[PDB]
Design a protein around this ligand. Sequence first.
Ligand SMILES: *Cc1c(COP(=O)(O)O)cnc(C)c1O
Ligand SMILES: *Cc1c(COP(=O)(O)O)cnc(C)c1O
Lengths: 487, 478
Amino acid sequence: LPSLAGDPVAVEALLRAVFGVVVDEAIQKGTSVSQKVCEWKEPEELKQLLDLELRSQGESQKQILERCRAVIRYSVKTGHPRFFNQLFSGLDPHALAGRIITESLNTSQYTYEIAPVFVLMEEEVLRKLRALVGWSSGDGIFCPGGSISNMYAVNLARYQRYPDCKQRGLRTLPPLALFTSKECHYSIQKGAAFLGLGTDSVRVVKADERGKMVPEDLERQIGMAEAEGAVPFLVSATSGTTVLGAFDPLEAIADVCQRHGLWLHVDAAWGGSVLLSQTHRHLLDGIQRADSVAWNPHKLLAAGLQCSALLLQDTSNLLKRCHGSQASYLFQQDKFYDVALDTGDKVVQCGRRVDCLKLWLMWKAQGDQGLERRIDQAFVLARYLVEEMKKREGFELVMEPEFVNVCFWFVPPSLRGKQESPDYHERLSKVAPVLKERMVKEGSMMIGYQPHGTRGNFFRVVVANSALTCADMDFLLNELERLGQDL
Amino acid sequence: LPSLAGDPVAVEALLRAVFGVVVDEAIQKGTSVSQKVCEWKEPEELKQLLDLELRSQGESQKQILERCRAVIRYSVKTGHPRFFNQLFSGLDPHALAGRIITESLNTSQYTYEIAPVFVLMEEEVLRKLRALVGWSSGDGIFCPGGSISNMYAVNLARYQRYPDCKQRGLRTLPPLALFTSKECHYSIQKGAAFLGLGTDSVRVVKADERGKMVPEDLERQIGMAEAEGAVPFLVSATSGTTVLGAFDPLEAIADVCQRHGLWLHVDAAWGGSVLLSQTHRHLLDGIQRADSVAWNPHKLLAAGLQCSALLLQDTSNLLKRCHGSKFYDVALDTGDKVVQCGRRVDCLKLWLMWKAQGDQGLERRIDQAFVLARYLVEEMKKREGFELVMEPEFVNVCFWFVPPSLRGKQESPDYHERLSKVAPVLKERMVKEGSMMIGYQPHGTRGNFFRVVVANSALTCADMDFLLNELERLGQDL
Ligand SMILES: *Cc1c(COP(=O)(O)O)cnc(C)c1O
Ligand SMILES: *Cc1c(COP(=O)(O)O)cnc(C)c1O
């Protein structure tokens, strides 16, 4: 019987050819301002171009390389400087190098025995993240997304309060109440439903005109929950909301939590990266008082999806106690290394991706200093965009940004001066969808839009890509004016 | 203000050099029988070799490339033909090509707007997987591991029966009962605890001498739950257990489920890939009767961690209804189907390999793994000092090595206790030599035995001979 792994003359030839296409088309053309951010195709046309159906007979190297080219060609270039659609943008070359190594090594982040380098590396990465929060002791894990990080935090808080629920379930326990801002309630609600608490267990707290949770309303809602028979157990503050980029007042919220004996979770998936900035880290003042912090380096630090940590001040092996399986004890296992290093008991996953190397390698190249410089420059470019938009006709700022989320309407010539008509906001709301379609079909830029509060669709420009220059901000304004002129 | 992304000349030089190191050290040396499966280092020594501390100042390209070399050198080679430690092994070069492309395109599998190729590609992959289960329509998702797929299945079954739980929570429901085999993955219990049901809601059903759930005991446990006023709602059958590789009797289990109106989930994380084999797919006969199927192509098909699908017969958007909070059809977007928000692209690595291989190529590999597993069993029987746990149903070959000092001593009163200590010593020896890695574990009433998983597409008969010869050599003085 022959090896079915592949002709090894073919393997080197294949990977060399593929990496050539990746360098030319994904890494170089995909980050070049002279190329398109996206090549729009209607779903049915793209199906035709991709010939997707999986079938009986295989294909040749030539056929495979043509498919690789097509996949890259028609994919959105998220590393492109004019990709502003998400809370990630850019292609850090060291993070990419780390990703490529990780994929080549294909292991599970599980035991020192199958992942010795990564068991040690993850520990260091989590220790460093904890240091930036303000903790020199604690624990933590990587999770497959911040949404799941948030769920872990809720599960851990529930377990600390009611450890028997791990065996008996929560059905006979009192009603549990958790609290979060109106500006960040989606994964919290999804998580509450998944964990068996129900979305009704989530009490949504008022946010002020800057998008910040109101501590007086938090206190009010805690009292109302108690009056309805519930047991408050957790408050989830948000340090960097997804739309406005607002930062909750952590010191005041920590005070409320302390008064009521509640677990404080900080959802810093987006804003946590600001801890690298000496100039801007004050936005998270009080975060060291948290019981848990979610932080996604795959967002502002550009580590690559997914890179999402849950950080704890805990030193009681709460993760292992809460998530661990019951061990058998009939026969001694004589493991020849310190199995305290292993993380299988800390997670509800079994197999787990290595997410630490892409972050670690980039952090080795950049240092704290390089990552700080990038954060600070993003803040500068966001403020530059705001200042420049005020000088042009048509741009209406939603609010002054606290972070790098710049939110605004584009008012086209046909609506300029018509602010006091009865259907103005209704008409203005239809503008961003049309402009988005045009920029996408042109391939020149992508900006996200959404409605929020009592107002209709406005743009959210996220200023995150380390490649950005002032000229890119100028381009964005110039292009909106050009695409919007006939609206 | 300058770009802070990097000088393009420096970037190309870095990436070409990293790729060279990866090809030389991870892909070539990491899959060569002339090289070590692992280079064992004690944690303290490895910490010194890696200089991990994250610091204020950055480093040069030369320094970064040195670190890349060290990371690869001291990592375990899971593509190596003598890596037998897990339910994945081998390095498929098309899957790897797909992985690299995926990482270079770094997007979220969330909307057609930011992932147009991958939205369409994932639709095809899920269609194909459903087709192989036996469904021409249905739904499904990729999940960050089979453990999470299993949890989704439980959440979905709960929601289908008691949709108001999504808002009102478990306190407002009757006690719920779910059922799984004694041989099942510990993820069902972890999942039950996470979902708020408690591990006590999981009724563990007896398995027979072949490691298969006993349908008569499933029925008995359902009746006992009902007698207590618990509401049965889900049975989780296992098609390919992690230790023995046993396959539950799905037709008989589906009959019990049908009689009681229960959701049938099949945990085929491991065994689901056998659906590609005409010869062996009968091991999953009845799977088309399931409501949900978990299947991990990252295990037997070698797609790359993680590649874990949850497949549903449902066509009524149960996923979006259960988990949910334009110039194209928003039906293409998948964000409402998951409790994740951002989601990795996992389909391309599988799809590209499947394009290269076809069903035919993947089938040939599955069939060859069964042939090599049977070869290993037959050869082991011919040597002194191997005791088979059972005849394998799959590619999990489980056995003790009995060293010369214990041969003939089976009737001694402390034989099993002494024998149990052998696998740990052999494991330490093979790891420190760097020649092979085989997992061991105890089971039932007896102690540590080896589980050799025959999955790597590069395996030959000579590798199976090597394994036996090496255990004999390493165990001679025990
Ligand atoms: C992104 C984000 C999340 C969810 O993170 P995922 O990794 O996409 O699951 C949760 N909360 C906030 C504030 C976020 O910015
Ligand atoms: C692997 C496996 C699982 C868990 O899958 P992960 O992807 O490691 O979370 C569950 N059940 C069975 C039978 C498995 O083989």
